Amino acid sequence: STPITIQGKEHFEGYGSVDIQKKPTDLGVSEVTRFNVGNESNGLIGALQLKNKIDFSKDFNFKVRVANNHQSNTTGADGWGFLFSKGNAEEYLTNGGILGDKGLVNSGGFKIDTGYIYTSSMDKTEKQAGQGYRGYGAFVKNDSSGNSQMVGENIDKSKTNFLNYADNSTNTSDGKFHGQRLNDVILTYVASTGKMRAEYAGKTWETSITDLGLSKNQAYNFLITSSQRWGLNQGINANGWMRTDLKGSEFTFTPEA
Ligand SMILES: [Ca+2]
């Protein structure tokens, strides 16, 4: 048992609709990994699989740098799904994750929801419908049937999952959250409590891994996932780029022995 602390795209295998974007002038870094490129009739689907499994007997702390597309919540990406599973990126490409109503079984994780999916009953309850980069953050469980259900709670004073995933700011160094700019998603797990917490957009959420359907005596794949209009056979209309800087991200955990 030795924790490792790692940074960089070389610790990930990319699968599906992912590439490198060199010198994104709108984001202020050397490069990002970019989700939701090209055009397909059944939409776009991508994952990064961390090359090591995570031992859930031990704590982890991740800091993932993500920028959401500056796009309406019906032409852009479905969101971010930070997903823990025994399932792997190839099965994710075929089966889906945590950004709709169905995906990979007995899995769970944290979503930044950036796409209003008219077929999604979850998007209705969370009032995602409307103009104005309307989104929400939540932990999601996929049960033994692959059905996606929100779990855990928002634990900010505000006690809502709603967040604006982008804005029209021309003053992005003003100290405030600009969701179209790179921002920290902090995912922290403490083995001795079973608590997983997500921090993003100044907001905080918490669940137990038992409420995610995961177990402390197991090692899991970790997938950074995105999808754009995936499964709506409405094709792709627009740029839906969901971009992450893996070099400026940092992952501390105990890999599977
Ligand atoms: Ca949604």
Curated annotation (Swiss-Prot):
It comes from the Bacteria. Coiled coil: none annotated. It is found in: Secreted, Cell wall. Residues 1-256 are annotated as: Ligand binding A region, squamous nasal epithelial cell binding. Promotes adhesion of bacterial cells to human squamous nasal epithelial cells, a phenomenon which is likely to be important in nasal colonization. Forms short, extremely dense and thin fibrils all over the bacterial surface. Does not bind to either buccal cells or non-differentiated keratinocytes. Promotes cellular aggregation leading to biofilm formation. Produced during infection of the human host. Does not bind to immobilized fibrinogen, fibronectin, IgG, human epidermal keratin, collagen, vWF, laminin, heparan sulfate and submaxillary mucin. When sasG is expressed at high levels, it inhibits adhesion of S.aureus to the ligands fibrinogen, fibronectin, cytokeratin 10 and IgG. This inhibitory effect depends on the number of G5 repeats present in the protein, since shorter variants do not present this phenotype. This is Surface protein G. It comes from Staphylococcus aureus (strain NCTC 8325 / PS 47). The chain holds residues 163 to 419 of 1627 of the full protein.
